[PDB]
């Protein structure tokens, strides 16, 4: 069970909001996690549909597409990634529909274009239609489903909207620091910290909005690789002392 | 009274009214409440039974001297054993 | 909700195909000459997370199980006060502790959660 | 009689000889006048004001992406059938063009969606918290660090059964820990 | 003004400040005001009309202080240069090497953005006694030496090494050792066979001094 504890900046320590912004900026977010129904549907003629709900979204972009999109109307796949997206999950990560949904996704490989609605609709429906050249071979063009199921799986699994890799969860916690008060004595002062489930210390360290001089993890090999060997020695000492002293036993300092 | 508290929490949870605690499932919340209630009941009963005892009690004399036993032993032999776990 | 369709000739499931000159969808059997006309543009469906209400499962002859508890709650339909009650029989980790009651006489299912 | 629009009302939309501006003005004027009984002249003046504000707050020749995003946001808000009242207000002038220029996407939503949004935000903020390990409270043991008797306990049969149970006491005021056996 | 522009600008400014801190820590002469340059002045100077960061104008030459020269007579001037290309080509590396050689500089710092071709790094050790060291940009955003768990290290001269070796009556293969790839060793630029002193806090005596050798 590797882990990593992040301490926020002095200014943002006492307020929950900047803490939640940082927590969203650290956790790993991928498309498969944010779709309540990323349903593979038949999309033979994307011009019109039978479902009334997506019909409203149709005329929005059909009056909002550029001339190049008008030319590329025929590139949209005879199948659709029809995204009924959950409102709660999308708003949890502070994820704007348009910018995050399309900028990075089309920038990555120019592979998937989208007809997307503004967040105000009661049902967040995106139409993900992949873009391919018309120069595709006749045998290739016949096997629509064969390409698109594969690219749809590679689409859900391999697109990262936001976050850092290998960090499964990030969680908020409240701790009680001891600080010298202005009169000179020591007083108890609360603070907000972020505890993860998964370690990637090279990238979490550079995220703006945290304290890059009080970060620590219970995986001393990473500290050895990143910070040095004396830092690894200190972390190893903390680990050994913690495991010994968590049982109430006392062993003098020289031995350890 | 501890049994009544546990029964009331069970009644509340069986009507989908109970609220899941911070970052922790509903079932875990119910189990946590039950365990805490039962442990506090055992501790309080043990402390009552210990306060009852006179000064000429031999077990109390041994415990006070510091040679054998503690208040847990008195509680289990006199008040109640408690909640078995695995 | 996509449904499997079997060919009327050899019971094999029908694969989709397109008709370009008429631009219409058809279902064909790869083994025979049967072709049938598609009634909807919905052929396949892939949901991810299941928003399914918890179900009591099999109910037939559940009143003869003698290890199942009892209650004296009153039936909302036949006004009987004898019934069987049990928790949700679907074994998900996060299922709530919401009861289910099966009436003894009319075999009516209801829950202890009367949310409007 | 007929759906009011630029072609139906006979109102010229080519005033600044800009193709993008011309077509966006035509589209917004058509969608605004399609279901509005308000006289077309003030509608055209409001359209001119809002397009002038769009151009002045962001040049299309330098920020065409942001221009398109803003136009899409406003246009989608206008077409939104869930809240028709807005097309009254822009017709009535209740909503100032500068407000539409500066406002975010959330505020233009109707009241029920607003309320759902705050409820979702509150639920997420509650669901981002960690497990709180609240321990049994008692007032018998004395802590050695701060001497505040608010010291939690936990006792179990862990040592060999040749010896009695083992207790561990942790002070909830300072963080001290110790064991008794 | 897309968000990525100012994000990259801020990270680049962070890396610039960290590199200045490193050069100051290597014994050179850098003013405190230059270290604490606010990002507004950085944007005013090292950005074009479009806000593109002009890395090529950031290359600079540093000289050692009086104290460093007194402690290390062999120490000489240093040059640092940034590279604009996402990947460094062979010709760019050759040009940088030739520039360093004609300037007759003893050491140089070459900061690259994403990757370096193997043929480019083929030329790194080909210019004795000059030393060429590379620092990936993504690893210089945060200063490592400012952490709480990293004690303070110091470099030792030949005379100090000899005096310690005599006083403890040791042979250099018995001291504790520190690798080359150790991040603090790269920070200080320690070569093979150099001794670094460590100052540390201690529950038992307050302060304690250890020593290590670069192997």
Short mmCIF file of C-alpha atoms in Angstrom, two decimals, chain A residues 16-17 20 23 55-56 59-61 63-67 70 87-93 116-122 169-174 176 178 188 192 195 245-249, chain D residues 23 27 68 71-77 79-82 104-106 108-110 113 116-117 120-121 124-132 145-146 148 154 168 172-174 177-179:
data_model
loop_
_atom_site.label_atom_id
_atom_site.label_comp_id
_atom_site.label_asym_id
_atom_site.label_seq_id
_atom_site.Cartn_x
_atom_site.Cartn_y
_atom_site.Cartn_z
CA UNK A 16 -11.23 24.22 1.80
CA UNK A 17 -11.77 25.64 -1.70
CA UNK A 20 -10.35 21.02 -3.50
CA UNK A 23 -7.20 17.78 -5.23
CA UNK A 55 -32.50 16.29 -31.89
CA UNK A 56 -32.30 19.58 -29.98
CA UNK A 59 -29.59 21.96 -34.84
CA UNK A 60 -27.32 23.72 -32.34
CA UNK A 61 -24.07 22.67 -33.98
CA UNK A 63 -26.01 26.02 -37.29
CA UNK A 64 -22.70 26.34 -35.39
CA UNK A 65 -20.23 24.42 -37.59
CA UNK A 66 -17.62 25.99 -39.86
CA UNK A 67 -17.33 25.45 -43.61
CA UNK A 70 -19.67 21.18 -43.49
CA UNK A 87 -23.39 15.65 -14.35
CA UNK A 88 -21.96 14.92 -10.90
CA UNK A 89 -18.76 13.25 -12.11
CA UNK A 90 -18.14 16.00 -14.67
CA UNK A 91 -18.62 18.77 -12.11
CA UNK A 92 -16.57 16.95 -9.45
CA UNK A 93 -13.30 17.40 -11.35
CA UNK A 116 -21.31 18.74 -28.14
CA UNK A 117 -23.91 20.70 -26.19
CA UNK A 118 -23.54 23.36 -23.54
CA UNK A 119 -23.80 22.11 -19.95
CA UNK A 120 -27.25 23.65 -19.50
CA UNK A 121 -29.13 20.80 -21.20
CA UNK A 122 -30.78 18.39 -18.77
CA UNK A 169 -7.33 8.41 -5.33
CA UNK A 170 -6.69 11.69 -3.52
CA UNK A 171 -8.45 12.45 -0.24
CA UNK A 172 -8.87 15.51 2.01
CA UNK A 173 -7.81 15.44 5.66
CA UNK A 174 -7.59 17.83 8.61
CA UNK A 176 -3.44 19.77 13.98
CA UNK A 178 1.74 23.14 16.59
CA UNK A 188 -2.59 24.20 18.12
CA UNK A 192 -5.83 20.80 5.35
CA UNK A 195 -3.40 11.97 1.18
CA UNK A 245 6.99 2.69 18.17
CA UNK A 246 3.47 2.02 16.87
CA UNK A 247 3.35 -0.85 19.40
CA UNK A 248 4.27 1.36 22.37
CA UNK A 249 7.71 -0.19 22.75
CA UNK D 23 -23.70 35.31 -40.76
CA UNK D 27 -28.43 33.66 -37.27
CA UNK D 68 -16.39 31.04 -31.65
CA UNK D 71 -20.75 32.82 -29.80
CA UNK D 72 -21.56 29.14 -29.30
CA UNK D 73 -22.24 29.67 -25.59
CA UNK D 74 -24.57 32.62 -26.18
CA UNK D 75 -26.31 30.98 -29.14
CA UNK D 76 -26.91 27.73 -27.25
CA UNK D 77 -28.30 29.73 -24.33
CA UNK D 79 -31.91 28.35 -28.40
CA UNK D 80 -32.31 26.62 -25.02
CA UNK D 81 -35.97 25.62 -24.86
CA UNK D 82 -35.95 24.82 -21.13
CA UNK D 104 -20.39 32.64 -17.16
CA UNK D 105 -22.30 29.61 -18.45
CA UNK D 106 -23.82 28.63 -15.10
CA UNK D 108 -27.63 31.80 -17.57
CA UNK D 109 -29.25 28.50 -16.53
CA UNK D 110 -32.76 28.47 -15.02
CA UNK D 113 -30.65 23.64 -12.79
CA UNK D 116 -29.19 21.12 -8.74
CA UNK D 117 -25.72 22.55 -9.41
CA UNK D 120 -24.13 18.56 -6.62
CA UNK D 121 -21.26 20.81 -5.54
CA UNK D 124 -19.04 16.38 -4.01
CA UNK D 125 -17.41 18.53 -1.33
CA UNK D 126 -18.82 16.16 1.28
CA UNK D 127 -17.69 13.09 -0.69
CA UNK D 128 -14.09 14.29 -1.01
CA UNK D 129 -13.44 13.81 2.72
CA UNK D 130 -11.47 11.01 4.36
CA UNK D 131 -12.39 8.42 6.95
CA UNK D 132 -12.60 10.01 10.41
CA UNK D 145 2.49 14.84 27.57
CA UNK D 146 -0.33 17.37 28.07
CA UNK D 148 -5.46 16.13 29.49
CA UNK D 154 -8.41 0.30 22.74
CA UNK D 168 -3.25 0.92 24.32
CA UNK D 172 -6.60 12.88 21.57
CA UNK D 173 -5.36 16.31 22.74
CA UNK D 174 -1.63 15.99 21.98
CA UNK D 177 0.58 6.92 22.89
CA UNK D 178 1.38 4.27 25.50
CA UNK D 179 0.64 0.66 26.43
#
